[PDB]
Amino acid sequence: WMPAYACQRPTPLTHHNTGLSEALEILAEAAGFEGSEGRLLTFCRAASVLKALPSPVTTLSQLQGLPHFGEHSSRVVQELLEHGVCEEVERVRRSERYQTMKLFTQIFGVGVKTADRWYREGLRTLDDLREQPQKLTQQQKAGLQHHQDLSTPVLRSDVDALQQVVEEAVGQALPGATVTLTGGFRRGKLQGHDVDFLITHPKEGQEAGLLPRVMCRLQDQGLILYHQAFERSFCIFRLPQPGSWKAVRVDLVVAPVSQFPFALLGWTGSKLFQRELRRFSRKEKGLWLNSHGLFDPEQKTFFQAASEEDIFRHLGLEYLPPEQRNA
DNA sequence: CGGCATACG
DNA sequence: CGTA
DNA sequence: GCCG
Ligand SMILES: O=c1ccn([C@H]2C[C@H](O)[C@@H](COP(=O)(O)NP(=O)(O)OP(=O)(O)O)O2)c(=O)[nH]1
Ligand SMILES: [Cl-]
Ligand SMILES: [Mg+2]
Numbered sequence: 001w002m003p004a005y006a007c008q009r010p011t012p013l014t015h016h017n018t019g020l021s022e023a024l025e026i027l028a029e030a031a032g033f034e035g036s037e038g039r040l041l042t043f044c045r046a047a048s049v050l051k052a053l054p055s056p057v058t059t060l061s062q063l064q065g066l067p068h069f070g071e072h073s074s075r076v077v078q079e080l081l082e083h084g085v086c087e088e089v090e091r092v093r094r095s096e097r098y099q100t101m102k103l104f105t106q107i108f109g110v111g112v113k114t115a116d117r118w119y120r121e122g123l124r125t126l127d128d129l130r131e132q133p134q135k136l137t138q139q140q141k142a143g144l145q146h147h148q149d150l151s152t153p154v155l156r157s158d159v160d161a162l163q164q165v166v167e168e169a170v171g172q173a174l175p176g177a178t179v180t181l182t183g184g185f186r187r188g189k190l191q192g193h194d195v196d197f198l199i200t201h202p203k204e205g206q207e208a209g210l211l212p213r214v215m216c217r218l219q220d221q222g223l224i225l226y227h228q229a230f231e232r233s234f235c236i237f238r239l240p241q242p243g244s245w246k247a248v249r250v251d252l253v254v255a256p257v258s259q260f261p262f263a264l265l266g267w268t269g270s271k272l273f274q275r276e277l278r279r280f281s282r283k284e285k286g287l288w289l290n291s292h293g294l295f296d297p298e299q300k301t302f303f304q305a306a307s308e309e310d311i312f313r314h315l316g317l318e319y320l321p322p323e324q325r326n327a
Numbered sequence: 328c329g330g331c332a333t334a335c336g
Numbered sequence: 337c338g339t340a
Numbered sequence: 341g342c343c344g
């Protein structure tokens with residue numbers, strides 16, 4: 001009753017196995033810090049299966065026949081069920097390696113490879129990085145300066161104000177261009193690490209060259225604290241607060257209207273949902289999916305899609321609204 | 328055992 | 337390398 | 341780490 005791919009089942013935002021999924025996601029995250037993508041994937045998938053269940057797991061036998069639960073993930077769940085704690089998970093949580101890789105990778109501009117190199121060099125804290133700013137890219141300097149504000153959740157109640165401001169710049173850049181809220185907030189999240197906006201125009205081709213024009217207008221209005229022909233922009237925005245403001249991460253992406261359904265599907269996530277959807281497409285359907293389109297490598301043809309609904313149908317999957325893509 | 332999503336800046 |  |  002549980003399909004193996006996350007895109008084959010509804011996954012709501014809130015569920016009945018929160019503590020169990022969070023524990024497996026710690027192990028997934030730690031696998032990622034050690035460069036083990038496959039283990040990261042298995043722990044993420046196992047976590048996701050639990051989010052999709054209709055009630056709490058209370059006994060080990062309820063894991064029988066669930067995909068992605070083998071000896072390791074089952075043992076994690078068993079210890080949590082028996083003791084309220086999994087020793088392996090706690091050991092990871094308090095390790096200096098986990099805590100520091102987590103701290104470093106949280107910085108905008110720093111990925112696993114950079115964090116790891118710094119870790120091997122003996123660096124442990126944000127102050128360690130600040131003291132040697134010679135070793136930092138301009139992106140990382142911005143990420144580090146703004147780190148405190150960027151560690152504060154963006155609130156859904158912030159989002160409408162930002163969208164209006166983006167729409168104003170977009171409207172001047174290209175009348176008729178639209179802004180669509182994507183990312184976690186579109187899946188119903190009440191908080192986020194950033195705000196993701198997808199921009200298009202109803203007349204195919206009119207959107208060419210649009211993003212630089214948008215960015216120049218936003219920067220002219222004094223709203224851009226950081227940004228770097230292009231179609232994706234990862235920036236840090238000045239967001240008004242009572243008597244002051246805070247720095248917020250905002251992503252902008254432009255797609256032609258022909259590709260909009262694919263870009264909307266990709267940017268709406270979740271990240272695991274999209275990886276599973278793409279894996280499903282390729283391995284089960286022999287079709288190649290990305291945020292631009294869906295390709296049949298035998299006919300050498302692209303599927304036209306007018307909606308996300310079209311794409312789920314192309315792939316032979318039941319439609320899932322964004323709120324059920326929280327894999 | 329091979330495979331693990333797929334792009335753009 | 338970073339990023340979504 | 342797990343599946344197929
Ligand atoms: O590696 C990625 C990262 C993101 N994405 C897609 C799915 C994800 O939901 C979307 C937005 O990326 P974010 O990093 O902004 N994550 P999300 O908005 O889901 O949550 P949050 O921003 O609150 O962390 O882009 C990928 O496809 N691959
Ligand atoms: Cl691995
Ligand atoms: Mg986001």
Ligand SMILES: [Mg+2]
Nearest residue numbers: 183194196251
């Ligand atoms: Mg984003």
Ligand code: NA
Nearest residue numbers: 105106107110
């Ligand atoms: Na980072």
